[PDB]
Amino acid sequence: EEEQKAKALRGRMFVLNELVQTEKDYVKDLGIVVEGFMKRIEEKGVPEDMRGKDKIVFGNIHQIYDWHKDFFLAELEKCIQEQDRLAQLFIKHERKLHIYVWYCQNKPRSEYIVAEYDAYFEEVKQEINQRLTLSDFLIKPIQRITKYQLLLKDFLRYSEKAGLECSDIEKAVELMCLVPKRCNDMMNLGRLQGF
Protein backbone atom coordinates (compact mmCIF):
# COMPACT_ATOMS: atom_id res chain seq x y z
CA GLU A 1 0.00 0.00 0.00
CA GLU A 2 2.34 2.72 1.25
CA GLU A 3 4.92 0.87 -0.87
CA GLN A 4 2.79 1.62 -3.93
CA LYS A 5 2.76 5.31 -3.00
CA ALA A 6 6.57 5.29 -2.65
CA LYS A 7 6.99 3.85 -6.16
CA ALA A 8 4.51 6.47 -7.41
CA LEU A 9 6.46 9.33 -5.81
CA ARG A 10 9.60 7.88 -7.41
CA GLY A 11 7.88 7.80 -10.81
CA ARG A 12 7.04 11.46 -10.38
CA MET A 13 10.63 12.53 -9.62
CA PHE A 14 11.70 10.46 -12.62
CA VAL A 15 9.35 12.38 -14.94
CA LEU A 16 10.64 15.67 -13.57
CA ASN A 17 14.26 14.57 -14.13
CA GLU A 18 13.35 13.61 -17.72
CA LEU A 19 11.60 16.97 -18.20
CA VAL A 20 14.70 18.87 -17.03
CA GLN A 21 17.22 16.81 -18.97
CA THR A 22 15.24 16.94 -22.20
CA GLU A 23 14.85 20.66 -21.56
CA LYS A 24 18.62 21.06 -21.37
CA ASP A 25 18.98 19.19 -24.63
CA TYR A 26 16.14 21.26 -26.14
CA VAL A 27 17.96 24.47 -25.22
CA LYS A 28 21.22 23.09 -26.68
CA ASP A 29 19.40 22.23 -29.92
CA LEU A 30 17.81 25.67 -30.21
CA GLY A 31 21.29 27.06 -29.54
CA ILE A 32 22.60 25.17 -32.55
CA VAL A 33 19.92 26.83 -34.69
CA VAL A 34 20.53 30.34 -33.35
CA GLU A 35 24.23 30.30 -32.38
CA GLY A 36 25.19 27.83 -35.16
CA PHE A 37 23.03 27.90 -38.32
CA MET A 38 21.96 31.55 -38.08
CA LYS A 39 25.43 32.75 -37.08
CA ARG A 40 27.06 30.82 -39.93
CA ILE A 41 24.61 32.38 -42.40
CA GLU A 42 25.62 35.93 -41.37
CA GLU A 43 29.29 34.96 -41.78
CA LYS A 44 28.68 33.20 -45.10
CA GLY A 45 26.29 35.71 -46.63
CA VAL A 46 23.16 34.76 -48.58
CA PRO A 47 23.04 34.70 -52.41
CA GLU A 48 21.22 37.73 -53.81
CA ASP A 49 18.29 35.53 -54.88
CA MET A 50 17.59 34.80 -51.18
CA ARG A 51 17.77 38.34 -49.71
CA GLY A 52 15.51 38.47 -46.65
CA LYS A 53 14.20 34.94 -47.10
CA ASP A 54 16.35 33.69 -44.17
CA LYS A 55 14.03 35.71 -41.92
CA ILE A 56 11.09 33.61 -43.14
CA VAL A 57 13.04 30.36 -42.63
CA PHE A 58 13.85 30.99 -38.98
CA GLY A 59 10.74 32.96 -38.09
CA ASN A 60 10.50 33.64 -34.37
CA ILE A 61 12.73 30.81 -33.19
CA HIS A 62 15.00 33.28 -31.38
CA GLN A 63 12.00 34.31 -29.24
CA ILE A 64 11.57 30.64 -28.31
CA TYR A 65 15.31 30.15 -27.70
CA ASP A 66 15.52 33.16 -25.38
CA TRP A 67 12.44 32.20 -23.39
CA HIS A 68 13.64 28.66 -22.63
CA LYS A 69 17.35 29.52 -22.20
CA ASP A 70 16.73 32.56 -20.03
CA PHE A 71 13.57 31.63 -18.12
CA PHE A 72 11.83 28.30 -18.61
CA LEU A 73 14.78 25.96 -18.13
CA ALA A 74 15.67 27.58 -14.80
CA GLU A 75 12.03 27.48 -13.68
CA LEU A 76 11.83 23.77 -14.52
CA GLU A 77 15.04 23.15 -12.56
CA LYS A 78 13.39 24.87 -9.59
CA CYS A 79 10.54 22.33 -9.90
CA ILE A 80 12.84 19.44 -8.99
CA GLN A 81 12.98 20.87 -5.45
CA GLU A 82 9.42 22.35 -5.41
CA GLN A 83 7.27 19.79 -7.25
CA ASP A 84 3.88 21.48 -6.99
CA ARG A 85 5.18 24.56 -8.82
CA LEU A 86 5.25 22.51 -12.05
CA ALA A 87 1.53 22.65 -12.91
CA GLN A 88 1.33 26.38 -12.17
CA LEU A 89 4.44 26.93 -14.30
CA PHE A 90 2.56 25.73 -17.38
CA ILE A 91 -0.77 27.28 -16.35
CA LYS A 92 0.48 30.78 -15.51
CA HIS A 93 2.36 31.12 -18.82
CA GLU A 94 -0.44 29.95 -21.15
CA ARG A 95 -0.34 33.23 -23.08
CA LYS A 96 3.40 32.76 -23.70
CA LEU A 97 2.57 29.54 -25.60
CA HIS A 98 1.29 31.64 -28.50
CA ILE A 99 4.91 31.87 -29.60
CA TYR A 100 4.61 28.18 -30.50
CA VAL A 101 1.27 28.58 -32.31
CA TRP A 102 2.85 31.50 -34.19
CA TYR A 103 5.80 29.26 -35.03
CA CYS A 104 3.45 26.56 -36.36
CA GLN A 105 1.53 28.93 -38.62
CA ASN A 106 4.69 30.14 -40.33
CA LYS A 107 5.94 26.53 -40.67
CA PRO A 108 4.68 25.81 -44.25
CA ARG A 109 6.41 28.93 -45.61
CA SER A 110 9.62 28.01 -43.76
CA GLU A 111 9.52 24.43 -45.08
CA TYR A 112 9.18 25.79 -48.61
CA ILE A 113 12.19 28.09 -48.45
CA VAL A 114 14.33 25.47 -46.66
CA ALA A 115 13.61 22.97 -49.46
CA GLU A 116 13.89 25.55 -52.22
CA TYR A 117 17.38 26.49 -50.94
CA ASP A 118 18.33 22.97 -49.93
CA ALA A 119 21.89 23.03 -51.35
CA TYR A 120 22.68 26.28 -49.49
CA PHE A 121 21.35 25.01 -46.16
CA GLU A 122 23.11 21.68 -46.70
CA GLU A 123 26.34 23.69 -47.02
CA VAL A 124 25.56 25.60 -43.82
CA LYS A 125 25.04 22.31 -41.99
CA GLN A 126 28.42 20.99 -43.14
CA GLU A 127 30.14 24.28 -42.36
CA ILE A 128 28.98 24.02 -38.73
CA ASN A 129 29.78 20.30 -38.51
CA GLN A 130 26.22 19.15 -37.69
CA ARG A 131 24.86 15.71 -38.53
CA LEU A 132 21.17 16.74 -38.55
CA THR A 133 19.71 18.83 -41.39
CA LEU A 134 18.20 22.25 -40.85
CA SER A 135 14.76 20.70 -41.33
CA ASP A 136 15.40 18.18 -38.56
CA PHE A 137 16.23 21.10 -36.20
CA LEU A 138 13.29 23.34 -37.18
CA ILE A 139 10.80 20.61 -36.27
CA LYS A 140 12.04 20.43 -32.69
CA PRO A 141 9.85 23.22 -31.22
CA ILE A 142 6.78 21.43 -32.61
CA GLN A 143 7.93 18.10 -31.16
CA ARG A 144 8.80 19.74 -27.84
CA ILE A 145 5.16 20.74 -27.23
CA THR A 146 3.97 17.14 -27.61
CA LYS A 147 6.82 16.06 -25.28
CA TYR A 148 5.55 18.37 -22.50
CA GLN A 149 2.07 16.89 -22.92
CA LEU A 150 3.29 13.30 -22.75
CA LEU A 151 5.45 14.05 -19.67
CA LEU A 152 2.76 16.02 -17.84
CA LYS A 153 0.46 13.08 -18.50
CA ASP A 154 2.94 10.62 -16.92
CA PHE A 155 3.32 13.12 -14.07
CA LEU A 156 -0.46 13.03 -13.76
CA ARG A 157 -0.72 9.24 -13.54
CA TYR A 158 2.06 8.88 -10.96
CA SER A 159 0.55 11.70 -8.91
CA GLU A 160 -2.81 9.92 -9.02
CA LYS A 161 -1.30 6.59 -7.94
CA ALA A 162 0.31 8.48 -5.04
CA GLY A 163 -3.10 9.79 -3.96
CA LEU A 164 -2.09 13.41 -4.49
CA GLU A 165 -4.15 16.52 -5.25
CA CYS A 166 -4.06 16.48 -9.07
CA SER A 167 -6.35 19.41 -9.84
CA ASP A 168 -3.86 21.93 -11.20
CA ILE A 169 -2.00 19.09 -12.97
CA GLU A 170 -5.11 18.13 -14.96
CA LYS A 171 -5.43 21.73 -16.12
CA ALA A 172 -1.75 21.72 -17.12
CA VAL A 173 -2.36 18.54 -19.15
CA GLU A 174 -5.54 19.90 -20.79
CA LEU A 175 -3.62 23.05 -21.80
CA MET A 176 -0.80 21.05 -23.40
CA CYS A 177 -3.35 19.01 -25.33
CA LEU A 178 -4.95 22.17 -26.73
CA VAL A 179 -1.64 23.74 -27.88
CA PRO A 180 -0.58 20.88 -30.23
CA LYS A 181 -4.12 20.90 -31.67
CA ARG A 182 -3.99 24.65 -32.30
CA CYS A 183 -0.51 24.16 -33.74
CA ASN A 184 -1.79 21.56 -36.19
CA ASP A 185 -4.79 23.75 -37.09
CA MET A 186 -2.57 26.75 -37.90
CA MET A 187 -0.18 24.63 -39.95
CA ASN A 188 -3.11 23.15 -41.87
CA LEU A 189 -4.46 26.65 -42.60
CA GLY A 190 -1.04 27.67 -43.90
CA ARG A 191 -1.16 24.81 -46.40
CA LEU A 192 -4.14 26.45 -48.16
CA GLN A 193 -2.07 29.18 -49.82
CA GLY A 194 1.55 29.66 -50.88
CA PHE A 195 3.74 32.09 -52.80
Side-chain angles (χ1 to χ4, degrees), residues 156 158-160 162-164 166-170 172-173 175-177 179:
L156 205 186
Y158 286 129
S159 307
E160 288 171 336
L164 298 164
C166 295
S167 169
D168 275 15
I169 304 170
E170 286 161 5
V173 167
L175 168 61
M176 305 300 314
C177 292
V179 173

Short mmCIF file of all heavy atoms in Angstrom, two decimals, residues 156-179, unseen atoms left out:
data_model
loop_
_atom_site.label_atom_id
_atom_site.label_comp_id
_atom_site.label_asym_id
_atom_site.label_seq_id
_atom_site.Cartn_x
_atom_site.Cartn_y
_atom_site.Cartn_z
N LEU A 156 0.90 13.06 -14.28
CA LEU A 156 -0.46 13.03 -13.76
C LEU A 156 -0.77 11.64 -13.20
O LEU A 156 -1.25 11.50 -12.07
CB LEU A 156 -1.44 13.40 -14.87
CG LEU A 156 -2.81 14.01 -14.53
CD1 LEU A 156 -3.66 14.13 -15.83
CD2 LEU A 156 -3.58 13.44 -13.34
N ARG A 157 -0.47 10.61 -13.98
CA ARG A 157 -0.72 9.24 -13.54
C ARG A 157 0.00 8.96 -12.22
O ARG A 157 -0.64 8.64 -11.22
CB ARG A 157 -0.29 8.26 -14.64
N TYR A 158 1.33 9.13 -12.20
CA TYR A 158 2.06 8.88 -10.96
C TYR A 158 1.44 9.64 -9.80
O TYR A 158 1.24 9.09 -8.71
CB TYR A 158 3.55 9.24 -11.14
CG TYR A 158 4.31 8.24 -11.98
CD1 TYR A 158 5.08 8.64 -13.07
CD2 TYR A 158 4.24 6.88 -11.69
CE1 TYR A 158 5.77 7.70 -13.84
CE2 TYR A 158 4.92 5.95 -12.45
CZ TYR A 158 5.69 6.35 -13.52
OH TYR A 158 6.35 5.39 -14.26
N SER A 159 1.11 10.91 -10.01
CA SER A 159 0.55 11.70 -8.91
C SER A 159 -0.82 11.18 -8.48
O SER A 159 -1.21 11.33 -7.32
CB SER A 159 0.50 13.17 -9.32
OG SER A 159 1.78 13.58 -9.78
N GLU A 160 -1.56 10.57 -9.41
CA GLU A 160 -2.81 9.92 -9.02
C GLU A 160 -2.55 8.65 -8.24
O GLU A 160 -3.22 8.38 -7.25
CB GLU A 160 -3.65 9.61 -10.27
CG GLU A 160 -4.27 10.81 -10.95
CD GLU A 160 -4.91 10.47 -12.29
OE1 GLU A 160 -4.49 9.45 -12.90
OE2 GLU A 160 -5.83 11.20 -12.72
N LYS A 161 -1.57 7.84 -8.66
CA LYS A 161 -1.30 6.59 -7.94
C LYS A 161 -0.67 6.85 -6.58
O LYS A 161 -0.62 5.94 -5.76
CB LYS A 161 -0.41 5.66 -8.77
N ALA A 162 -0.18 8.07 -6.34
CA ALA A 162 0.31 8.48 -5.04
C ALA A 162 -0.77 9.11 -4.18
O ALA A 162 -0.48 9.58 -3.08
CB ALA A 162 1.48 9.45 -5.19
N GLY A 163 -2.01 9.16 -4.68
CA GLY A 163 -3.10 9.79 -3.96
C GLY A 163 -2.93 11.28 -3.72
O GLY A 163 -3.33 11.78 -2.66
N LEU A 164 -2.35 11.99 -4.67
CA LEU A 164 -2.09 13.41 -4.49
C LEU A 164 -3.19 14.26 -5.11
O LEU A 164 -3.95 13.80 -5.96
CB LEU A 164 -0.72 13.77 -5.09
CG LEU A 164 0.47 13.06 -4.47
CD1 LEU A 164 1.68 13.18 -5.37
CD2 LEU A 164 0.78 13.62 -3.10
N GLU A 165 -3.26 15.52 -4.66
CA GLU A 165 -4.15 16.52 -5.25
C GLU A 165 -3.69 16.83 -6.68
O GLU A 165 -2.64 17.46 -6.88
CB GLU A 165 -4.15 17.78 -4.38
N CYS A 166 -4.45 16.38 -7.67
CA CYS A 166 -4.06 16.48 -9.07
C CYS A 166 -4.75 17.61 -9.83
O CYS A 166 -4.69 17.64 -11.06
CB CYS A 166 -4.35 15.17 -9.80
SG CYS A 166 -3.43 13.73 -9.27
N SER A 167 -5.42 18.54 -9.13
CA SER A 167 -6.35 19.41 -9.84
C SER A 167 -5.62 20.33 -10.81
O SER A 167 -5.97 20.41 -12.00
CB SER A 167 -7.19 20.22 -8.86
OG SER A 167 -7.90 21.23 -9.56
N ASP A 168 -4.60 21.04 -10.32
CA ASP A 168 -3.86 21.93 -11.20
C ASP A 168 -3.04 21.17 -12.24
O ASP A 168 -2.74 21.73 -13.30
CB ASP A 168 -2.97 22.87 -10.38
CG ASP A 168 -3.72 24.12 -9.88
OD1 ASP A 168 -4.97 24.13 -9.93
OD2 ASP A 168 -3.06 25.09 -9.44
N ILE A 169 -2.73 19.89 -11.99
CA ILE A 169 -2.00 19.09 -12.97
C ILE A 169 -2.91 18.68 -14.14
O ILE A 169 -2.46 18.58 -15.29
CB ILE A 169 -1.37 17.87 -12.29
CG1 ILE A 169 -0.47 18.31 -11.13
CG2 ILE A 169 -0.63 17.04 -13.34
CD1 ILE A 169 0.02 17.18 -10.24
N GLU A 170 -4.18 18.41 -13.86
CA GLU A 170 -5.11 18.13 -14.96
C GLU A 170 -5.26 19.34 -15.88
O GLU A 170 -5.35 19.20 -17.10
CB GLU A 170 -6.48 17.71 -14.41
CG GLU A 170 -6.53 16.30 -13.83
CD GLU A 170 -7.71 16.09 -12.90
OE1 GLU A 170 -8.54 17.01 -12.78
OE2 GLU A 170 -7.81 14.99 -12.30
N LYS A 171 -5.32 20.54 -15.30
CA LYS A 171 -5.43 21.73 -16.12
C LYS A 171 -4.17 21.90 -16.96
O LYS A 171 -4.26 22.19 -18.16
CB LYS A 171 -5.68 22.96 -15.24
N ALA A 172 -2.99 21.68 -16.36
CA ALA A 172 -1.75 21.72 -17.12
C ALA A 172 -1.78 20.74 -18.30
O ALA A 172 -1.38 21.09 -19.41
CB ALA A 172 -0.54 21.41 -16.21
N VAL A 173 -2.27 19.52 -18.07
CA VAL A 173 -2.36 18.54 -19.15
C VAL A 173 -3.35 19.01 -20.23
O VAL A 173 -3.05 18.98 -21.43
CB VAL A 173 -2.74 17.15 -18.61
CG1 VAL A 173 -3.14 16.22 -19.74
CG2 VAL A 173 -1.56 16.54 -17.82
N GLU A 174 -4.55 19.46 -19.81
CA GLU A 174 -5.54 19.90 -20.79
C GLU A 174 -4.97 21.00 -21.68
O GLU A 174 -5.12 20.96 -22.91
CB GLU A 174 -6.82 20.38 -20.08
N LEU A 175 -4.29 21.97 -21.07
CA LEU A 175 -3.62 23.05 -21.80
C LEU A 175 -2.64 22.52 -22.84
O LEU A 175 -2.64 22.99 -23.99
CB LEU A 175 -2.91 23.97 -20.80
CG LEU A 175 -1.93 24.97 -21.40
CD1 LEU A 175 -2.67 25.90 -22.32
CD2 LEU A 175 -1.24 25.77 -20.30
N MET A 176 -1.79 21.57 -22.46
CA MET A 176 -0.80 21.05 -23.40
C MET A 176 -1.37 20.00 -24.34
O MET A 176 -0.65 19.48 -25.19
CB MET A 176 0.41 20.50 -22.60
CG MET A 176 0.96 21.58 -21.67
SD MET A 176 1.54 23.07 -22.56
CE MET A 176 2.50 22.35 -23.91
N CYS A 177 -2.65 19.65 -24.21
CA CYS A 177 -3.35 19.01 -25.33
C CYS A 177 -3.87 20.04 -26.33
O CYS A 177 -3.80 19.82 -27.55
CB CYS A 177 -4.49 18.13 -24.80
SG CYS A 177 -3.95 16.66 -23.85
N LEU A 178 -4.36 21.18 -25.84
CA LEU A 178 -4.95 22.17 -26.73
C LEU A 178 -3.89 22.85 -27.59
O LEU A 178 -4.15 23.15 -28.76
CB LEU A 178 -5.76 23.18 -25.92
N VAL A 179 -2.68 23.09 -27.07
CA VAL A 179 -1.64 23.74 -27.88
C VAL A 179 -1.22 22.93 -29.11
O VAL A 179 -1.20 23.50 -30.22
CB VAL A 179 -0.42 24.11 -27.01
CG1 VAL A 179 0.68 24.62 -27.91
CG2 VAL A 179 -0.78 25.16 -25.97
#
